[PDB]
Design a protein around this nucleic acid. Structure first.
Ligand SMILES: [Cl-]
Ligand SMILES: [Cl-]
Ligand SMILES: [Cl-]
Ligand SMILES: [Cl-]
Ligand SMILES: [K+]
Ligand SMILES: [Mg+2]
Ligand SMILES: [Mg+2]
Ligand SMILES: [Mg+2]
Ligand SMILES: [Mg+2]
Ligand SMILES: [Mg+2]
Ligand SMILES: [Mg+2]
Ligand SMILES: [Mg+2]
Ligand SMILES: [Mg+2]
Ligand SMILES: [Mg+2]
Ligand SMILES: [Mg+2]
Ligand SMILES: [Mg+2]
Ligand SMILES: [Mg+2]
Ligand SMILES: [Mg+2]
Ligand SMILES: [Mg+2]
Ligand SMILES: [Mg+2]
Ligand SMILES: [Mg+2]
Ligand SMILES: [Mg+2]
Ligand SMILES: [Mg+2]
Ligand code: NA
Ligand code: NA
Ligand code: NA
Ligand code: NA
Ligand code: NA
Ligand code: NA
Ligand code: NA
Ligand code: NA
Ligand code: NA
Ligand code: NA
Ligand code: NA
Lengths: 194, 92, 237, 56
RNA sequence: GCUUUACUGCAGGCUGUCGCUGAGGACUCUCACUCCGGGAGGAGGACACCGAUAGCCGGGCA
RNA sequence: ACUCGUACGGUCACUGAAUCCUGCCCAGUGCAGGUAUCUGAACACCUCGUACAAGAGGACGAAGGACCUGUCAACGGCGGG
RNA sequence: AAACAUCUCAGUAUCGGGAGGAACAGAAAACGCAAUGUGAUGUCGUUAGUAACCGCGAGUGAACGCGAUACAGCCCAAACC
């Protein structure tokens, strides 16, 4: 039969309807008062967290991060620029808000490593995301066959190098075929054209 | 100048002389779906849009004749070279 | 060109800032839990560097010593009261509602409890005209009719130091001394006396504005200069 | 007053001094910042790619 | 470098529209949101702010 | 920032002590106000088109413009016959 | 580009953040010599200055496949406990 988890998920397909709607209308009020990075005891979306690697266990941490909505906060040119480069208003960043959020979280917990993240809604001027981080130094994790991989040296600061899930999709690495000529194996090896 | 609305002349389709009717070519409406229409949208962005930032040229003092010759029997039309004419009016 | 003077202002550099460290007190009404039992005694009359007008030091029953926006006719020893039950005499503060009409008031609050915003300069005064269980129409010194919450506290009387504007500075030196006590760059160079690069009115073989002086409300900073969105100009008509 | 020789006489102010971090006489004692290594401004040592030719 | 009713654009201002955003061509309300208030509470209120977009102005700037 | 500030304030400009004074002009340009009607973008809406879509057209119409007015100690003007 | 605005120089110079001895990628929601076919990923040779872009100007510019190098394939979430 259906898992209870399936219900959390089914609700989040329409965060603007039903009980979840009223729930969000309430939470955000408290959220808008919390900081930029708040550690939370339990994931707001259990199904999603667990689906992404979460585990009620020592060394596993979760944090909700808030980020402003919209295009790039850019300063206008202060020297000569051809018309093509005089833009300010329509310029958008190449890194999506979710990655920004994943980075702000990881910096807050210097010793932890990003595992994954998911959205938990947005009001008119900001978006919230919950990030799952892991303590690569806690033995409870170094002995977990399903996570100890994140303990390796080469997984250090993985979020800042785009090795995250959101980091990899944003890098255009989803497709294995047509369209990924300039993305795989990396954007930089392809002269930054993807 | 003046010109007959109908008159006998060669029909390239029938391959034989017949009465044709002369009419000025009414411009057709664009669909906005040609390749050029797509390039305009695609290539226009921040700053100058190259060729798409240009505007309508101008006008020659007198235009050439722009007519359609319709074969009175087979119903098909053909085009001819035009000649400069300040004004062109039909007779009947 | 270069940013005009009006633009250098906003950065808030020394030259444009007010000598705040040399100011005495931020003149605001007291915060009473409620009751009116709040009264104090005028202890001294001091000069307020920020307004070129006197201000009065007052000691309140509850040991509180604070400077206050002094209305005209307040002396050392006088007893002032602040509350809903405040007596109706010069220097006392109480909500517009409890104040009788036709009585001049000063240091009027825009929002009940904001401490007072209107009518605070030398010799000015507001005029409470109408009441109601909702609106308290007051006429500010500019001549405008301002609808206000009757719960807004105010002070009875006209501000002290009236008539300060009647005497001419006569000389540059006097202007200078006053100017030094304000957040303002002085003296003033005319735009038309500048170079094209420094001001929209600069340049030329002779001095004259380049275009018309009336500028649109929508004009951008660096260009909004001269007669801003003037509905009319001159004296004629 | 000449901006040259005559204005050189007023120069008796001490600004740049031996730096505690790098040893260069670039520590600005007024700003408490080394113009050479970045001490006082950055934990990381000051360095730029323009300090050498682009392909070197 | 500078100017302007030179060409092309870019900030900025004004204005419509969408999101935030809710209850009963004009209107009431309160619950988001904003502001005043130490607080209780007051004012304002689905507007404003902010995000997006559209039209106008736009040598302030390239 | 102005601002420990509140129109007897402070911002933006012009002229430049005193004395006697400061005429005529609102067509153009500017600014501002109004505006029956005209013009006026996008979303949503209606029609056609497309098993959908592109697209074409319609209805509505904000600021703005037309149009009207105010204003020269606003840019400036004050001739020929 | 014999001017110049798209284009080009170039995702270069330079700047911000970070890893390792190598990084990154990686076991198909692939390919599409259309097949009764191939079978994770890098890289080298080629495909090819071809397809594609472009005031269709000047310029710009891949991929599949093939020949090689080296080869390696697995773990969760959920169902049921
Ligand atoms: Cl990380
Ligand atoms: Cl013709
Ligand atoms: Cl003054
Ligand atoms: Cl194949
Ligand atoms: K260029
Ligand atoms: Mg590589
Ligand atoms: Mg453009
Ligand atoms: Mg104050
Ligand atoms: Mg004066
Ligand atoms: Mg000063
Ligand atoms: Mg002057
Ligand atoms: Mg000069
Ligand atoms: Mg200028
Ligand atoms: Mg003069
Ligand atoms: Mg003059
Ligand atoms: Mg010099
Ligand atoms: Mg506040
Ligand atoms: Mg220029
Ligand atoms: Mg050239
Ligand atoms: Mg050419
Ligand atoms: Mg290129
Ligand atoms: Mg291919
Ligand atoms: Mg297992
Ligand atoms: Na970290
Ligand atoms: Na790309
Ligand atoms: Na494109
Ligand atoms: Na001038
Ligand atoms: Na020059
Ligand atoms: Na006029
Ligand atoms: Na006029
Ligand atoms: Na050349
Ligand atoms: Na040139
Ligand atoms: Na081009
Ligand atoms: Na083959």
């Amino acid at each position: 039969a259906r898992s209870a988890y399936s219900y959390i998920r089914d609700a989040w397909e329409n965060p603007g309807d039903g009980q979840l709607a009223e729930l969000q209308w309430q939470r955000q009020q408290e959220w808008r008062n919390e900081g930029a990075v708040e550690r939370i005891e339990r994931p707001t979306r259990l199904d999603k967290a667990r689906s992404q690697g979460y585990k009620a266990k020592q060394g596993v941490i979760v944090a909700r991060v808030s980020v402003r909505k919209g295009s790039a906060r850019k300063r206008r040119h202060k020297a000569g620029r051809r018309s093509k480069r005089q833009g300010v208003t329509r310029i958008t960043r190449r890194k999506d808000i979710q990655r920004v959020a994943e980075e702000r979280a990881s910096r807050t917990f210097p010793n932890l490593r990003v595992l994954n993240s998911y959205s938990v809604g947005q009001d008119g001027r900001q978006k919230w995301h919950e990030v799952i981080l892991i303590d690569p130094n806690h033995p409870a994790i170094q002995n977990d066959d399903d996570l100890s991989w994140i303990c390796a040296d080469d997984q250090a600061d993985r979020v800042f190098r785009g090795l995250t899930g959101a980091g990899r999709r944003n890098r255009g690495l989803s497709g294995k075929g047509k369209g990924s000529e300039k993305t795989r194996p990396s954007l930089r090896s392809n002269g930054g054209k993807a | 100048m003046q010109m007959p609305r109908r008159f006998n002349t060669y029909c390239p389709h029938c391959n034989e002389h017949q009465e044709h009717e002369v009419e000025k070519v009414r411009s057709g409406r664009q669909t906005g779906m040609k390749w050029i229409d797509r390039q305009r949208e695609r290539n226009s962005g921040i700053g100058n849009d190259g060729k798409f930032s240009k505007v309508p040229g101008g006008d020659k003092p007198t235009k050439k004749t722009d007519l359609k010759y319709r074969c009175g029997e087979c119903g098909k039309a053909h085009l001819r070279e035009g000649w400069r004419a300040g004004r062109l009016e039909f007779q009947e | 060109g270069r940013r005009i003077q009006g633009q250098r202002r906003g950065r808030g550099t020394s030259t444009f800032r007010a000598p705040s460290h040399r100011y005495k007190a931020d003149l605001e009404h007291r915060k009473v839990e409620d009751g009116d039992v709040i009264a104090g005694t005028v202890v001294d009359i001091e000069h307020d560097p920020a307004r070129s007008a006197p201000v009065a030091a007052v000691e309140f029953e509850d040991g509180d010593r604070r400077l206050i926006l002094a209305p005209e006719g307040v002396g050392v020893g006088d007893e002032l009261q602040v509350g809903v039950s405040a007596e109706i005499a010069p220097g006392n503060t109480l909500p517009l509602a409890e104040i009788p009409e036709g009585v001049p008031v000063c240091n009027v609050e825009s929002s009940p409890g904001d401490g007072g915003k209107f009518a605070r300069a030398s010799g000015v005064n507001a005029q409470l005209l109408t009441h109601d269980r909702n609106v308290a129409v007051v006429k500010l010194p500019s001549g405008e009719m301002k609808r206000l919450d009757p719960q807004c506290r105010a002070t009875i009387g006209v501000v002290a130091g009236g008539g300060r504007t009647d005497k001419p500075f006569v000389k540059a030196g006097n202007k200078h001394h006053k100017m030094k006590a304000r957040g303002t760059k002085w003296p003033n160079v005319r735009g038309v006396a500048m170079n094209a690069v420094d001001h929209p009115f600069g340049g030329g073989g002779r001095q004259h504005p380049g275009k018309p002086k009336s500028i649109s409300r929508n004009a951008p900073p660096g260009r909004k200069v001269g007669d801003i969105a003037s509905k009319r100009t001159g004296r004629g008509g | 007053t000449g901006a040259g020789t005559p204005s050189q006489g007023k120069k008796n102010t001490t600004t740049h001094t031996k730096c505690r971090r790098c040893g260069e006489k670039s520590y600005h004692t007024k700003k408490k910042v080394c113009s050479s290594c970045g001490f006082g401004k950055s934990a990381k040592r000051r360095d730029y790619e323009w300090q050498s030719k682009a392909g070197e």
